[PDB]
Symmetry: D2
Subunit: 267 residues, 4 copies
């Protein structure tokens, strides 16, 4: 068990194709004992999570809610037992209003929409860290989910900006987490067929956006020297468990590419 006896908080499960769901599953297969957080649709999330290899408390967390944040650590400690701490935290959370994405002009997204997106997608990495570092063990790991924003691309639009912000935040979180002996890192994943991605591909953000997204997926597996299967989230779950383990002890404020190697290849 890569994660034997480690205690890990996992956020961002919404369906059974969530990257968070596969992160959780793999971790439990590797002996981790889990605590889960969900946003808003808790009966759905309970129902979905009942299918994991093992039982795990589910805690409500709206990342934009001050009270949820303020009460989070107490709730976790309650769930894992007093005198016990977390060895790992997983941030698999994101959101951007439609106006900030797809065939909707870049220039036409109101700041209030862009602000909400950055709030949930970037700022919350800092917020969760703030709430949870006090109840983490030395040797601990924090992991967030990333999509390489170092270049502009069609349709991703303002989410790219949110990911750029996130990478920056991750480096500062690394500075804070360090005072606790805790690592902080991001996993940069290739495209995966999830609820959030289904939106885009299915034309809910405009048909041309859906088309560019599809071309994206296809170019990816082409570039990837080992290929890329956008229906299989396991390779990125396995990568996230690696960061949660003891086997990358000298890495922090850093980005790990679980993308088939695509970003290293121009063509």
């Amino acid at each position: 068990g890569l994660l034997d006896g480690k205690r890990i908080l996992v956020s961002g499960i919404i369906t059974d194709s969530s990257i968070a769901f596969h992160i959780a599953r793999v971790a439990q297969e590797q002996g981790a004992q889990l605590v889960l957080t969900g946003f808003d649709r808790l009966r759905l999330i309970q129902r979905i999570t009942d299918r994991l290899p093992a039982k795990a408390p589910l805690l409500e967390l709206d990342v934009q809610n001050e009270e949820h944040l303020a009460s989070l650590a107490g709730r976790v400690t309650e769930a894992i037992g007093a005198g016990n701490k977390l060895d790992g935290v997983v941030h698999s959370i994101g959101f951007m209003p439609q106006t900030g994405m797809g065939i909707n002009p870049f220039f036409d997204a109101p700041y209030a929409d862009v602000s909400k997106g950055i709030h949930i997608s970037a700022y919350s990495y800092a917020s969760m860290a703030k709430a949870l570092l006090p109840i983490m063990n030395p040797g601990g790991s924090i992991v967030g989910m990333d999509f390489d924003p170092s270049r502009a691309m069609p349709a991703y639009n303002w989410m790219t900006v949110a990911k750029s912000a996130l990478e920056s935040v991750n480096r500062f979180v690394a500075r804070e987490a360090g005072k606790y002996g805790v690592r902080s890192n991001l996993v940069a994943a290739g495209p995966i067929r999830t609820l959030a991605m289904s939106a885009i591909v299915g034309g809910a953000l405009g048909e041309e956006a859906g088309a560019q997204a599809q071309l994206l997926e296809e170019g990816w597996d082409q570039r990837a020297p080992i290929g890329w299967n956008m229906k299989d989230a396991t390779p990125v779950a396995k990568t996230v468990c690696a960061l949660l383990s003891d086997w990358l002890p000298a890495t922090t404020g850093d980005i790990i590419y679980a993308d088939g190697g695509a970003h290293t290849q121009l063509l």
Copy 2:
């Protein structure tokens, strides 16, 4: 005259040590005809700008004001004469509440403060572009001011995150500006003794912050293979005029380092 007969909008002048002020001065020395925008203290800015080599209309612009943005192009066209367009736009604007900077813990900046910062420092590059592209000429140039955020550093804190966002925005603005034959780029400057920098160094953000800022300035001139004078903004003004000229016609969505070469050297 590098900028003979070009029409250039310059924002961000607040004192006579503003990077924007030296940008404006150099440009006029190079034959540009200017239009200026200022935030809030317009009598001060008029008074300051009266010292430029030549007269130039001053227009009010609060980057967070919808009406200012909406009316901006009409006001400019009024100032430069109907049937005339802009050949250049300079964004030299930034702001971050104290909570997001210095010895104030990273984790203690409220999102409302961080949001305001990103609004003025990143989002506004898109906002200005949106308002001004319609009245720009093909061959035109947009330039923003940057401070290399690719690594975390003490004290800069949330402004770094804002700069990360800005670089991302710049790449998307490049996509829009391209439809007009207009370039968009950022200048990444070394440390310059300005009002905004005086804050930091002078301990208004905490003494330890002031001390780290001073160490920063010093390491900079050390690393720079040609050195760095933090009292002299001319080298970065000259660099911004280069981008505004016809001599970098094949560059866009890109970052130019006016930093003495510091970022290319580890030690």
Copy 3:
């Protein structure tokens, strides 16, 4: 005249579609007085260079020849007049044996071939600098030609490795050049139809290589937010003259992308 009264050494002219040829032409249009160097086919190069806007001495230079290097500065000073120095140096030189490129397996290039390539394409930037810095003026500029090697690509193969080396060398040359008040930088160009590129596209390195090169050119203009014309070397000549001018005084050990903005865009 951007380059009025500046004295500039330009290497790498072989035909009239050489990037070096267009660099030279633009510079002379901008008032520079030139000295030229050529490799091996000097009658051809004389004949080609007779078509520049103005007369300019031609000096022999095999970059792998110790004597040429050793005698270079004496020959230049002879050409520009004693007591006169160089304000600029242009490195537009490259070579890689066929074994290191195209459909010829990466693994099948003998080190002796790869060594020759790196010698001429990377190491020589240091060699020229060494020979010429002693006869340069403060305020001076050295410029090399680059093709962004930060990612792997088909066919470019070992030349990519040579370009990676070159970028590294450029940063160290910046350290040396700095002791003289001289800048050193690279221009990263998009694809241009030259003799060296004609090889590749024309199938002399294998048909599949020719095909990947053609796809490359096409994706480029697609990605470029302002487009890209691979038949027009002027935009990169103009960019090289900018670096040779006084208008980027705070840039060194750095890379400037004259690539239409392509590298900033994923899709």
Copy 4:
């Protein structure tokens, strides 16, 4: 056992403070069965390797020797048993003549010296891959040792250029290795007190070089958000075993920083 029943080739052991030695030790602790290669001083290396947790064949390999390379796979297969293949390959090899390093001027390293360095330090990653890929299993991993060359630094000089080349080579090796289902990646380590590093620090490359190296080590632990112990190679051995394991299946042609997070922090 992270590496249970995997067969791994490890190169670059010279003393018991070699990164390769600690790589080998950790791997065996994790259940790997090993084959070792050494350069030139084989009695020394045998003697040193006798101290590993388990016995492992030692094979001679001069990376510049064509016959060694040509015969390598036959020798390995002989050592691991016919019908058995390698699951992992470790490249922990480097060399640069003194002229290319330290207080010896950058400009004064003869190409023949720089060529030898690049041969052993960069080119050999391709050479080993070429010799060994045919006897590797799908799911396999190749790992090389790196020192982040993205910026210039004192004293490292031409080794930096060699590391720049190596990173480039790694991306192309990823393309070849991919045809076999094999990953290729580099580990970028922080400073470690080894034989090769002892040289530098001890003034054998000049006292000023020794002094800059010492300052380097010190700045490192300062920048590292989790710190850095230059006497402890275990954290980078653990990181190399992670890449050799099944837990980073979607990473290739890539670089992993085992550097305490130093490269992510400016100050």
